[PDB]
Ligand binder design. Structure first.
Ligand SMILES: COc1ccc(S(=O)(=O)N2CCCCCC2)cc1NC(=O)Cc1ccnc2ccccc12
Ligand SMILES: COc1ccc(S(=O)(=O)N2CCCCCC2)cc1NC(=O)Cc1ccnc2ccccc12
Ligand SMILES: [Mg+2]
Lengths: 451, 448, 450, 458
């Protein structure tokens, strides 16, 4: 160990650690979860520190030689070379002060290995506060997770569902309402519904981006911008947009709202919770369709990871959706509980919304590639059941009457025969209608209004 | 106390009741909450039945005499004349078929008084099913609630907050972070933040309208449109848009999605929940600002309705209810199966209540709390003059290094920056008292 | 349309209204939900005001003619004769002070009709504050809801599920795990599980009562009991227990915890939420078992209210969703108390009391009109169990796992029993007798029922 | 690296890995969260497999050389020696069968290093199925977390709050209702309330243990106990209780309920959620009481734990109350995910177990750790601003009521108005209006305005 210091005095730190006294106090203050910042959060903090140093350089506030050392150390952090140098718990001071200092101290220690002396606060934290930096890094990470990762994953799941919709366009089967047999549909129509739910999900994520991408940077301690250049925010956002290509990043509409609240994360979590609700419906329908092989619905076979495969990716999708619903409740609870100039639930809210992005992204790709793409339908079986259902006798009423239609339905179920065969067996052809009329009235694919 | 005849027996119905046997059976089946449809839901069922009869008449499927009687009866229901004729519990068959049949039977009874015989199913339910009607009426009610009621109420609250942000632009006070003393802000700056939260709320509601306004009508039992005209949904939506003025109403993008799921209600509830989160922070700050007046912050005075912050308490209680209703909505939303989501009556109750509560409490908060707030300007300035100061605004006068030495000694000796500058003998040609006092001015430090 | 004069001007009160000026101001201040107190709330406020007057009379603080007039008026409220005289929104001042004043005013007006002048504050609110009354009434209502109504309704459901468990003791059927076919169970064993879930639900409600029944009465404004007799709480609780028979009512263990927090409501909501979770699983299994009549599981038929929609499982799952939502609202109000008072009580009271009511009513309906009348497709269930690949494992020791796999594949392809498939493949002989085959494929023995 | 062979082909496994082909397939199948089982779950799986080997050896079903090798390997897992050998995602097959197989394979690999050959399924999984094991380990872990860790951590916080209640027995201050000035209380009475909340929290956790401690072991695939000895569950429970001292572990009341549902976890999460609600109120009151030091309430001072800002150098923040309120928010989220999974079981099996286990065990860990830190690093070192608190109580309009019987309610209200206008004590305002006369001596005023007596401290 080695001795390091802060406005509170002297602290023993691991001899080899790149962090300093404030990070070490945080390590001892918050042994709560045993988990620290994720890769995406560290990347975002590195991106922001490099952008701040660039702007401080461009305004002549920071010596070119200091700004270059910060930019080089922050690039190393952003690329993942120092992840083991971020040991602070998620459950830390609610501004994320502790992780901001962690980034500053690590950058100063990297710079010192290259013979440049940087102060963690005076130079690395120049024109910045914890109050504006940790929420900015959080919104960068969330905007990147939405745009670069979740929307493409959802687009892959949409396309896999839409491909099934087309492949199964004529795969007629009984409709089910209240779990009870109903008039015919096609598997393709049901898959077109699932596809729409995922396309609407993408629309919900895109709708939240104008507020999710709002950055607090430039507001400093309380939103007033004191101790920062009047244009710090716009210059830093411009640098981040050029480095990331995330045109969704923008300066906050109101600098006070951007620090006093995290309502953009709450809004975005609502979109993710809606996607979780959609995925639960899609996954539950698929596992029920694949149920059996004898005593279940036996409509489709899921690919193995026969018709005896356990629906393991529907189970992973429904467990992920439950987690997103829980995370969403935690996010809203933190979002509501800000006071005055600062919401002090940022580390917990960041943990939850970034996890929800990650789980939905990863499970959506797995579901698309390793379940949806490989589903096979019991086509002839589905059609036979549709042709054997009491639900399709209604179009006979005007020819044979209500009472005889009911007797046809009862006999078809009892003898396990089609409606067409039961109408013929009861001797109804000729007096009431012809074979041509029967085949028109009982065409289950036409009843599904597909071609 | 009349008697009616039904397939499994005789049904006893109150005499002034316009509902018939199916509704009476549902009354006996579901004695669960003792609460039925709200006025907004009844209105939407009447609007939908009038529009369907208008379209069936236009397509020549329904005789003009019968269509005119349904249209006139449906206009009375939509105008709130029959809010006592819908006795069925909210906790009913999950398609809302019971309430659909309730509407059909009340229209048939109204028409019989004007001397026309309508069959509840074959005439009033023509081209409709037991499954595309109640979700359509729900989305009509929810879209009307959002566009005609909630957004204007939020705009009233935004405008009241923004008016305070301007009045109090220069009312300097201490900033608080972590509940601890921080650098100065103005009361107007804080109110500008509240106003932005409500403006963003209006943006959040507007963003959900493309999906909230999707109607299932025309998809019939399973979404295929079997037993409806091919253009039923588009024609009914046009009639509803023309009669309501709600341009946000639209046909569903996908008729299967629109019946298998109620994702548009889950999305909209998310927007309402975000507004509840915003309102909680605004209401909590206002009650804390009004706290005391000896033991608290005593920053503002709330209008009296020692004043208890009763409208902040109503707002925070409403926000808790919207958070709970939002969890019920999502639970129902997730649990659809195959062609139909059977949680619609419960989802409808919860989202329509969340819209009503937010609309009503926002207008009350705006008119009876925000508009009448008074700032304790002298107290607030005394708090600003007790905030921490910084040395930066002295840099040009004493240089980076003396400033850093003022900062160090102020921290070590627990002194203000001002007193530390004086005690270090720095008042001279480089820095007068005037220049010290102008550089450290608390309203200047707030950067208004 | 009669007129009344307040401390702040003129107020019009409906003519047949028994409330007075302070209630009418609250009607004007809080037009939010359009829903006021439920009947259980109103009853409890009446019970509490009767007991307080009884105690104030016993201690010589209140003239007996006034106490008798309050006691008779509060009894009419407790009996549900004045449920239309409580017009204040649920979304009111968060102590419930407005509904407290509503009760005081209605009692004074009832007494006035009998010739007795009561001051709503000085007489009807004597020894009480604006902060210990409404939460006491809420805990009286919730405790009565739990003991008198929800536990008996859950016991009815338990007894119905248990009756079916016994009736279906030998009704063998395929088991399902992950929705896939598994080794045999009986419908009776599955119903015994549902019954246990409801019996555990009753245990959960019973376990919260020590804290649900704690009353704040006697704590006054901040919990110190200032301006009330030192023994007011134990006296009033004793009167409530003697009059109602609700032995679970008790004074609070800590008078400050009893007003600063509503943690007993949050605790009880958690028990109701667990019951909602259990009922969701029971109702979802029952509607799936009744799915069909052709393309579904077709294990059982639900009674009409093979083609009946499962309307009472839909009512039960909708109620469960409501109870989940209500539970989130309760916890949110619970967490947000400050210092000496939690000011979310009206909202918490609405949610907890609704959850009790919905679970009570739907549990009795589900027991009587769904569970009691279920019918099993007994021979169909046994045939499927006897035709499942899941039951070939007991053949392995006689014919080998490779030939057992061949039997399973052919039985499924030809829609035949495993037994018929073994005979059709000519496996009966010295390696396996017909009696040995019947013993190995005894699906009811595989279910291991009592 | 080192290759292996599965029923579906050839699997590459890391060289130092003790897991085998099935675990490697599960690693490839579920790259979802990148987080696997926690040490408490790994320990419970080890405890369970050792107990099962003990019982199978006792019934004569498993050869003693094989049982001893399983017991020795299972004790290494339960002792935390192999926490890097469980790489499968939380978000796996919903029975937890993948993690069950992980345990079997790791035990077989540990046994191989000692020259004993164990079949992961036929030996390490003997009398067990893919469905009664993981929920049993979950309930063992949750019961151990409740009894051995959470209840003691909550007792430490209770004792710290109760010690402050005693120290501040006479520290009078104004009460606050609706955030407005109220009649007097003592800081000790308020802390007595906080202590009761935590004591009630312990009562809520004990009240769930009769059902949290119920184990599914013995029920096999569907709860019937097919392919297990009839008394397997009681035998394994007897061994676990004897070895761990966890008296709360029991065989399920109904073997179907214990596999079809995870209602015991939903119940337990409700207790943890109630504790989170109580902790939120306590932590929020404490940070408000410590607010300022010049623009807030300044009722107490919290011990300084780290620099709070560089822009405002001496500013120190209520970081432990913030950690507590963030933990509480996490527990309320976790609680909603647990109830969602609990509700969604079907027929003989609830297939949300790995997700419910992650959430319930994290809630226990966060509450345990943050309770201890809050007791030791915040509550124990609080100091009260006694003279500030008393000054405000003695200046409160709320204390004029006891003057009514001497000078009348109208004159008392006049004293209140003047005192609040002129920033004086009530006592001084009474003197400054010349009311000391025939119905009120100076000692009689001091008796009526005794603010500590008005608080009515026991
Ligand atoms: C809901 O599942 C069902 C519903 C009804 C009926 S029925 O009796 O009314 N009937 C109609 C179909 C024609 C043959 C005679 C049986 C059967 C079934 N299931 C099956 O056939 C199960 C099944 C067994 C074997 N191979 C299969 C291959 C693919 C799919 C399912 C398979
Ligand atoms: C999951 O539902 C199934 C699963 C498998 C099979 S099977 O093809 O493998 N099969 C085995 C049963 C023996 C004759 C038919 C062949 C059928 C079925 N459903 C049915 O029989 C549907 C059915 C039709 C008519 N009457 C019924 C009366 C009660 C219940 C269900 C009925
Ligand atoms: Mg003060």
């Amino acid at each position: 160990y080695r001795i390091e210091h802060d406005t509170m005095g002297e602290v023993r730190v691991p001899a080899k650690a790149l962090w300093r006294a404030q990070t070490q106090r945080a390590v001892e203050n918050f042994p709560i979860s045993g988990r620290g910042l994720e890769r995406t959060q560290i990347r975002a903090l590195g991106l922001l520190k490099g952008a701040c140093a660039q702007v401080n350089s461009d305004l002549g506030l920071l010596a070119p030689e200091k700004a270059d050392a910060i930019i080089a150390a922050a690039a190393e952090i952003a690329d993942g070379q120092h992840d083991d140098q971020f040991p602070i718990d998620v459950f830390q001071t609610g501004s994320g002060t502790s992780s901001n200092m962690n980034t500053n101290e690590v950058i100063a220690s990297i710079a010192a290995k290259g013979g440049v002396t940087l102060h963690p606060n005076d130079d690395v934290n120049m024109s910045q506060s914890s109050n504006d930096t940790f929420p900015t890094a959080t919104h960068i990470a969330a905007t990147e997770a939405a745009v670069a990762h979740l929307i493409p994953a959802l687009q892959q799941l949409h396309d896999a569902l839409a491909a099934k919709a087309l492949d199964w366009h004529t795969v007629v089967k009984s409709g089910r309402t209240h779990l009870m047999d109903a008039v015919p549909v096609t598997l393709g129509q049901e898959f077109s519904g699932y596809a729409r739910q995922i396309e609407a999900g993408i629309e919900r994520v895109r709708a939240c981006l104008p507020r999710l991408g709002e950055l607090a940077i430039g507001g400093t301690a309380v939103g007033t911008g004191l101790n920062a250049p009047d244009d710090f925010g716009v210059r830093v956002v411009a640098v981040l947009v050029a480095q990331t290509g995330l045109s969704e990043l923008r300066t906050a509409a109101n600098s006070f709202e951007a620090q006093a609240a995290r309502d953009g994360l709450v809004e975005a979590s609502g979109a993710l919770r809606t996607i979780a609700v959609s995925l639960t419906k899609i996954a539950n329908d698929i596992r029920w369709m694949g149920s059996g092989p004898l005593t279940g619905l036996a409509e489709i076979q899921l690919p193995d990871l026969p018709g005896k495969v356990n629906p393991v990716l529907p189970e992973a999708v429904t467990q992920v959706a439950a987690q997103v619903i829980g995370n969403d409740a935690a996010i809203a609870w933190g979002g509501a509980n800000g006071a005055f100039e600062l919401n002090v639930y940022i580390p917990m809210m960041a943990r939850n919304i970034l996890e929800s992005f990650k789980l939905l992204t990863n499970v959506s790709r797995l579901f698309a590639q390793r379940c949806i793409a490989g589903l096979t339908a019991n086509v002839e079986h589905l059609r036979r059941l549709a042709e054997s259902s009491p639900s399709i006798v209604t179009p006979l009423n005007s020819a044979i009457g209500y009472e005889e239609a009911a007797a046809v339905a009862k006999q078809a179920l009892k003898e396990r025969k089609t409606i067409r065969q039961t109408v013929i067996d009861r001797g109804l052809i000729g007096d009431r209608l012809s074979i041509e009329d029967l085949d028109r009235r009982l065409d289950v694919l036409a009843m599904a209004k597909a071609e």
